Design a protein around this ligand. Structure first.
Ligand SMILES: Nc1nc2c(ncn2[C@@H]2O[C@H](COP(=O)(O)OP(=O)(O)OP(=O)(O)O)[C@@H](O)[C@H]2O)c(=O)[nH]1
Ligand SMILES: Nc1nc2c(ncn2[C@@H]2O[C@H](COP(=O)(O)OP(=O)(O)OP(=O)(O)O)[C@@H](O)[C@H]2O)c(=O)[nH]1
Ligand SMILES: Nc1nc2c(ncn2[C@@H]2O[C@H](COP(=O)(O)OP(=O)(O)O)[C@@H](O)[C@H]2O)c(=O)[nH]1
Ligand SMILES: Nc1nc2c(ncn2[C@@H]2O[C@H](COP(=O)(O)OP(=O)(O)O)[C@@H](O)[C@H]2O)c(=O)[nH]1
Ligand SMILES: [Mg+2]
Ligand SMILES: [Mg+2]
Lengths: 45, 426, 428, 161, 426, 428
């Protein structure tokens, strides 16, 4: 019985933390405005 | 005081809603941490129109972001100005509304409408009195035409005394995104005409033509369309939040611009718009802003207003300006091309001035009109609908969720006699 | 969250799965063991400390291809008992895969996909990959979709068949197999795209200059197609679509659900250098009447619906303007009643190239899933290939002496003929 | 303690590695004979298994050390040129000490070392830190199941720490 | 001047009073040893209502830990805040009930009931004049539903004027844990209905959906339910410990909640319940606490109040507040809900501002209401009872330890007699 | 504190106890010399300087299985006086064990049982591990249990039987002495958990991948079963199940008390790391028809009560979710007098693994023990088997020789005939 270093099978560390209603989302250039944001701002470079 | 509940729905609805809070927060000095960096009383003297203080100096918005699919909630929250809303108001489904009106209005939206209605009555019954709701759904697709219009019937019968404005995005059949657009459009007109009082039709062909021909941008994206729409969105409710000489709430737009209670689909266009070069050559004054808003390559509907007539109109002038030039310029347009302005209404339009201009600008106009050229919108989608319904095209889904053959014939009828009610006032 | 179980049946179905579960592994970052050095939720259930396993079953009534994966590189990517095998296959016979050897394999396979579907209720649908030209692919694949309808029914069942080619068939009894399996292909699947082999040979003969391609190259192009339909099913994107959004926007009538597929650009290193990839350019080569991946001229027919999956560095107005130029060409026709026949979906993730493969590192790609009346042709070649053999009962004593009786061959004839009259009455 | 001294443990192309080059890996000895039909049948399966494990991953997971039960040095090198993993020279008495420790002999038993239980040829056996046995892969044992008992390996829970 | 004697019964009772004696002890500033370690002089005023002072400066709780399994109090005495109790009132059995109602109320509880009634009356007889007793009995099991309810019968005759307020945990059928929970529950009800004053019913099912749909946590333990009830245990006894602007004790909750002398069973809520994400975005003032109080999801019973009338109530607000936002929101919800409110009573609401909130919290409230909508949770158990008892299933071990068959058919005869009584006031 | 005196009879009971007492030693770490290099007081009695001695009495009328464990590795653990042995084997014969050869050993076995039942406070049950397949197991098992009924009347007396499996039968007289032992199993036993050989044959090949296991591998499975059953008594955890309430939630009528069993995470470590053993996965693997360790299809007969012994790191709420998963499933049927049909327990320490065994590490296991009406045809299949040899009375002269008045076969005929007759009387 000296073999006590037998690591657990199936990586089951059940989620003690709260759930995540939000998953990662890459910020997209297509839904980011730019362009007309500075055209409706009278920038005058 | 008077609060405007914002009832974003669908992928198009939440994306234009996020940019709407991106153009209202920068006017109100709001950081996306709820704080206020600014030095004017004028930004918080009426902060209760769109923002609610929650016990920590944070002005969380009144926005009820919904859909039936778990994707575009994540894009908004992780996006810019995203960590400003309330996650309880991020009410969503888990399945996918696959451009199907039947399972957005009748079956799948039925088990989510009760939870969304709880959220909207949460932030609407606790106030002094609400001025009115504000939906920004899209009238093409599954949950925009579905879940978006389903609540419109439910909260109309719950509050049948208040203004209900809808920045609906009509489908573009010239070049489109789906095939079942005619079904998702005709089955949403007949309940947007009986349970709504200010529709604001927005086409994507206009959003693409006027960003490229007027603004002279080679490739401006979806968020660029969102900022163009949301610029008009802020300019309709400018007078509610910011003070002005001739103020105008949403009900003031309705009382002056609705000839008959069924004729309430409105054109809308924001009309200072110069290109990258012409920002230093154009002259910002009231006559030049007046000429732009009647010019058809400023219009955000892509139904040409000079093919029809003008029952009535309006222009929310926004900025410091002299008020004679507000109203003497409007008979310059009413007397020059009087072939459009109809004869059974003298001085067809409603002017208004809110003193605070939008950010960066000095003077802006938000032209809203009721022209009988939107009957061309209901004409080209009628062409799409009668070609498909005559051959029972794409039907087994819709008859699959229980809704049957009969209500197409009054969906066509409610749109056809709406065209006939625009023929006999031009 | 969202997930699909990818059933891989037959011998060609396993060989497609060998290519798809290499491209998907490179796309998600999964090692051949399973560890990584949350988009991995439609394919890889997290059974470990970073140790993933595909939500797939490898199914063939012959052991030789199943054990070869079991002794290959991805012998620990896959759970060992997900690879179900038998001993006698079906040998080129519908009724052996459907009746006799099929008793003892359907009970453990449908048990296994039950244990693959219980990990999440938010399953989008089932995939099934087969070759309807031989024994196990058509035979067991028929009985599988029979019992799949009496279990989860409203759940979608897609299909990526490997239909027999006009002159390529590499079997003698294959018109008996293909015709008699159309019953499962017409009443038990929802998306039924055809993919015959020597169209894909032609793709890597004109656009890749490979005079000597193998089956492993064809599976790689198929795996790139599967990657591009389910690219929206795992990633972000400007326009997001799931499997039910395909069916509602591409299938006009319930019987008419056989699709065609194209993918562009199929280009290599010596080609990709001297050519500018713009959205109009890829969608032009996808719409040309030779890039179709099952041998069906779209000119000899009328389009009914069209789904396009833009993927990568693509802006929506290059989609929205180049789709108009397709509609203006008179060589392509939408039939009478779909003058909005275009479902465009935009992704951000570029197509990942398998290193030392045969494709480039293109930043933008389109896959086609289209419906047309032209595919009366792909089923009418089986009319004179089946009935002319069946006139005096060729290759029949195997099928009748082994459970199925004569008369079911007749039933398959008006099942295909009712499908044939259906496509000609719709497009007029 | 030390199992393999400084000059005992040599891999392919005859470079000696010390005990330091073996942690983090699942280590087995492999007692095999060159002329033995069991070993000749088992060796391709061991080669394929070793190649798949130690090629498809982010770490070198398993590791095998050969011990010859053959007759001479030419038979050693003829066997040795076929395996790529570690090995011990036959003339080192370390092989005999491992033979007596892990009980893997070849029926020459009463002439020198007359104890009991035998556990004959071949035997791949996984070991640990102090040279203790961990688990027996049952090729020729009470399970007597050949050429697939290599799959009975446990690399995660047996490591040379 | 007022004293409460607390007895914990069953494994549920000795683990829900284990956390109750954690939450009320740091509210009074008590170390695990027993010393006073607090920040306010307003902790040491009514320590007498839950504690007895010992030698040396060490307060000992008035807690009788009552069970027949010895292992439960072994874990309590080993866990935190369990060595605070006096060892002589750890009245432990060794045989233990087999989840039988006979095991405790007729045999192998009756020899030990003299051991528990002696230690109860030792604490009870030493008092100025005590309010009454609180018992955490656990309907569905064998010891809390068994010998714990015999404590309810055999304390009522010695103290017939002192209150018999009692917390209960009924067995919900989808969170069922024992097959004979129908028999234990309905045998524990018909004795509790004639000997009790205030039965605060709690369900494990509704403890799950308040932590899954409001506290936003998936499967992270069972002790989350104990702490949520333990806030409600101390929220009702705010005035017996701390001063209040308006005062109400449990005798106040007797007259203003029980209309007729068989209307005992009450519904319990607690509603400053905020999730992790909505912590920054939620206003913690009075209007947002009166809406979650009456939110049917927040109630700790799966006995939906919208499916029934609503006789009386008590609003136990706890935090410094103005009384003139307590009570208009009582009449606001009473006018705006209307039909879900009994009609032969003008005001169905009670209010009592307690001046000191629990630590962390600025402001809290605990619902104690008497609604008819506990009829469906009772009738749900009665459907279970008529399942086995119609053929006499699982019955040869309730008749082998004493009982006849007559008390089972009497347990249902007054069961349906009560649910009909609750029903006809609707 | 608590203790459960184990009584093993027959070579099957002795070898089972060689694996059960093997595994109890390694759960709470106790070396074979008694020494440990308050939880041990469930199966051990501390006496002296760390000399933990088991609570067992070995029993066999032949000196072969218990002399061998005297010379094995447990000469010092098993203290050498309760290993009761005889000389003449009962030889597969009920008339030998229950009669002439066997009264000499009941007297000494009752002495050591009385010493072990009156040396620790509050004994809690008697776990008997008998073998109704032969001689000493059935004969001495029946006589001994009939004396415990009057010596301890209020007492819980769980059994663990090896009933003759249908096709596997290693002795031809098994049908006689199985029916003859129902008199000892119908009115003298509280819990009658049913095991047989060929179901634990199948449970090891398709799950642990050993195609040639042995009775060691069988008894390791049985040792896992009773370890989970007695894990709540020995150890601590939320919502404990005692032996006192074990039969209270499984025995509806005093005569129908014949239960079954299934374990759940019985996976070798190779395909154990590749599956995520969730709560819903293990409970449906527990309710799987093939996971019963009895030939009992639990689909021809409706369930009546279940006792799901979860153990390890399991939260008490997703147990309710997975129980609700089973309830909504129509393949797991229930009968109408149980809207609730589950009593579940939960321990906290993980299910142990034996070093050198066929199992792996999991901190969860469902040892569900269920009382269903589908146990009836296990007995009724033995009814047709018993009548075919009794018709012309072969293998009877031995029974009539050492006892067995002719008519004990007839009363055991009607005793077991009244047994299953109760079962379809209950479930209608
Ligand atoms: N695309 C593709 N098609 C293949 C491949 N291998 C075989 N096929 C096609 O499959 C058809 C023959 O069936 P197979 O897949 O070989 O085998 P089967 O029908 O599943 O029956 P069994 O051989 O008994 O398993 C022929 O039309 C082949 O052209 C492949 O690797 N890729
Ligand atoms: N599970 C299991 N069953 C066993 C084992 N050994 C024997 N059996 C079964 O026991 C049944 C007969 O009982 P035995 O142990 O062989 O003999 P007995 O009960 O001691 O009585 P005798 O016949 O007098 O020796 C057979 O059906 C065997 O299948 C074992 O080690 N494990
Ligand atoms: N103007 C604009 N249109 C959008 C946006 N997102 C999607 N759309 C349009 O919405 C149509 C597709 O509808 P969809 O969003 O799928 O409907 P849903 O079911 O509500 O999600 C397409 O024509 C898009 O052009 C956006 O951010 N702005
Ligand atoms: N809320 C809560 N419920 C519990 C707790 N412990 C057990 N329960 C449940 O309460 C019910 C009552 O059982 P109970 O009488 O206490 O068990 P017994 O002491 O063994 O008789 C059981 O079915 C448990 O599921 C706890 O700590 N908190
Ligand atoms: Mg083939
Ligand atoms: Mg034996």
């Amino acid at each position: 019985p000296s073999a006590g270093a037998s690591i657990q099978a199936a990586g089951k560390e059940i989620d003690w933390s709260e759930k995540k209603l939000f998953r990662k989302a890459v910020v997209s250039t297509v839904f980011a405005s730019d362009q007309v944001a500075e055209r409706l701002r009278q920038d005058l470079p | 005081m008077r609060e405007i509940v914002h009832v974003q729905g669908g992928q198009c609805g939440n994306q234009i809603g996020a940019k709407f809070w991106e153009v209202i927060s920068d006017e109100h000095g709001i950081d996306p941490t709820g704080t206020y960096c600014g030095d004017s009383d004028l930004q918080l003297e009426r902060i209760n129109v769109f923002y609610n203080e929650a016990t920590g100096g944070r002005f969380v918005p009144r926005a009820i972001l919904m859909d039936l699919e778990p994707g575009t909630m994540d894009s908004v929250r992780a996006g810019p100005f995203g960590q400003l809303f309330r996650p309880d108001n991020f009410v969503f489904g888990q399945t996918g509304a696959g451009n199907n009106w039947a399972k957005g209005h009748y079956t799948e939206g039925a088990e989510l409408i009760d939870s969304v209605l709880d959220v909207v009555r949460k932030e609407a019954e606790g106030c002094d009195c609400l001025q009115g709701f504000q939906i920004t759904h899209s009238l093409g697709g599954g949950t925009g035409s579905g879940m978006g219009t389903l609540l419109i019937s439910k909260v109309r019968e719950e509050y049948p005394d208040r203004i209900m404005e809808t920045f609906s995005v009509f489908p573009s059949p010239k070049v489109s995104d789906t095939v079942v657009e005619p079904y998702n459009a005709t089955l949403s007109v007949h309940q947007l005409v009986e349970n709504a009082d200010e529709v604001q039709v927005i086409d994507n062909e206009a959003l693409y033509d006027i960003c490229f021909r007027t603004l002279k941008l080679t490739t401006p994206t979806y968020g660029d369309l969102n900022h163009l729409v949301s610029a008009a969105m802020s300019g309709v409710t400018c007078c509610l939040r910011f003070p002005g000489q001739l103020n105008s709430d949403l009900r003031k737009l309705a009382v002056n611009l609705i000839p008959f209670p069924r004729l309430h689909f409105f054109l809308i266009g924001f009309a200072p718009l110069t290109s990258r070069g012409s920002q230093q050559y154009r002259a910002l004054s009231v006559p030049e802003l007046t000429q732009q808003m009647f010019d058809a390559k400023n219009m955000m509907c892509a139904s040409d207003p000079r093919h029809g007539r003008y029952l009535t109109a309006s222009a929310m002038f926004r900025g410091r300006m002299s008020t004679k030039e507000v109203d003497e310029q409007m008979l310059n347009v009413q007397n020059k091309n009087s072939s459009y302005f109809v004869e059974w209404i003298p001085n067809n339009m409603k002017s208004s001035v809110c003193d605070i201009p939008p950010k960066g600008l000095k003077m802006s106009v938000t032209f809203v009109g009721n022209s009988t050229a939107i009957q061309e919108m209901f004409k080209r989608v009628s062409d799409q609908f009668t070609a498909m319904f005559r051959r029972k095209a794409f039907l087994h889904w819709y008859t699959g969720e229980g809704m049957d053959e009969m209500e197409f014939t009054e969906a066509e009828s409610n749109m056809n006699d709406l065209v006939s009610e625009y023929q006999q006032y031009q | 969250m969202r997930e699909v179980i990818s059933i891989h049946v037959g011998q060609a179905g396993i060989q497609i799965g060998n290519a798809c579960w290499e491209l998907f592994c490179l796309e998600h970052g999964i090692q051949p063991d399973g560890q990584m050095p949350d988009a991995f939720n439609t394919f890889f259930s997290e059974t470990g400390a970073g140790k993933h396993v595909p939500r797939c079953v490898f199914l063939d009534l012959e052991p030789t291809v199943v054990d070869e994966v079991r002794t290959g590189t991805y012998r620990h990517l896959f759970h060992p008992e997900q690879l179900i095998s038998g001993k006698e296959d079906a040998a080129n016979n519908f009724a052996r895969g459907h009746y006799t050897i099929g008793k003892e394999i359907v009970d453990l396979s449908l048990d296994r996909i039950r244990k693959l579907a219980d990990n999440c209720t938010g399953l989008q649908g089932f995939l099934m990959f087969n070759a309807v030209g031989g024994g196990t692919g058509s035979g067991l694949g028929c009985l599988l979709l029979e019992r799949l309808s009496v279990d989860y029914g409203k759940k979608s069942k897609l299909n990526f068949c490997s239909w027999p080619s006009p002159q390529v068939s590499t079997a003698v009894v294959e018109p008996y197999n293909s015709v008699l399996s159309t019953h499962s292909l017409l009443e038990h699947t929802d998306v039924a795209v055809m993919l015959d082999n020597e169209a894909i040979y032609d793709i890597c003969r004109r656009n890749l200059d490979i005079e000597r391609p193998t089956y492993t190259n064809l599976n790689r192009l198929i795996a790139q197609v599967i990657s591009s339909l389910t690219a929206s099913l795992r990633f972000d994107g400007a326009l997001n679509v799931d499997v039910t959004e395909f069916q509602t926007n591409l299938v006009p009538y319930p019987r008419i659900h056989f699709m065609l597929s194209s993918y562009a650009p199929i280009i290599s290193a010596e080609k990709a250098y001297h050519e500018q990839l713009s959205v109009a350019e890829i969608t032009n080569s996808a719409f040309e009447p030779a890039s179709m991946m099952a041998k069906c001229d779209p000119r000899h027919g009328k389009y009914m619906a069209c789904c396009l999956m833009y993927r990568g560095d693509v802006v929506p107005k290059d989609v929205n303007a180049a789709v108009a130029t397709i509609k203006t060409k008179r060589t392509i026709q939408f039939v009478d009643w779909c003058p909005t026949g275009f479902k465009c979906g935009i992704n951000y993730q570029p197509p990942t190239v398998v290193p030392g493969g045969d494709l480039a590192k293109v930043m933008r790609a389109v896959c086609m899933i289209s419906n047309s009346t032209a595919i009366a042709e792909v089923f009418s070649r089986m009319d004179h290939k089946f009935d002319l053999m069946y006139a005096k009962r060729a290759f029949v004593h195997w099928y009748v002496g082994e459970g199925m009786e004569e008369g079911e061959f007749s039933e398959a004839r008006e099942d295909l003929a009712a499908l044939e009259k259906d496509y000609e009455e719709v497009g007029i | 303690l030390i199992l393999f001294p400084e000059g005992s443990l040599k891999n392919s192309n005859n470079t000696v590695i010390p005990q330091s080059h073996l942690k983090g890996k699942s280590v087995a000895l492999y007692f095999a004979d060159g002329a033995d039909p069991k070993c000749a049948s088992l060796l391709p399966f061991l080669l394929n298994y070793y190649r798949t494990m130690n090629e498809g991953g982010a770490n070198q997971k398993i590791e095998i050390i050969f011990v010859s039960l053959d007759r001479d040095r030419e038979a050693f090198e003829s066997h040795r040129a076929h395996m790529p993993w570690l090995s011990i020279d036959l003339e080192n008495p370390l092989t005999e000490i491992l033979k007596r420790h892990f009980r893997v002999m070849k029926e020459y038993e009463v002439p020198t070392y007359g104890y009991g239980s035998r556990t004959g040829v071949p035997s791949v056996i996984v070991i640990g830190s102090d040279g203790r046995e961990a688990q027996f892969l049952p090729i020729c044992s009470g399970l007597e199941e050949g050429d697939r008992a290599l799959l009975r390996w446990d690399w995660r829970n047996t490591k040379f720490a």
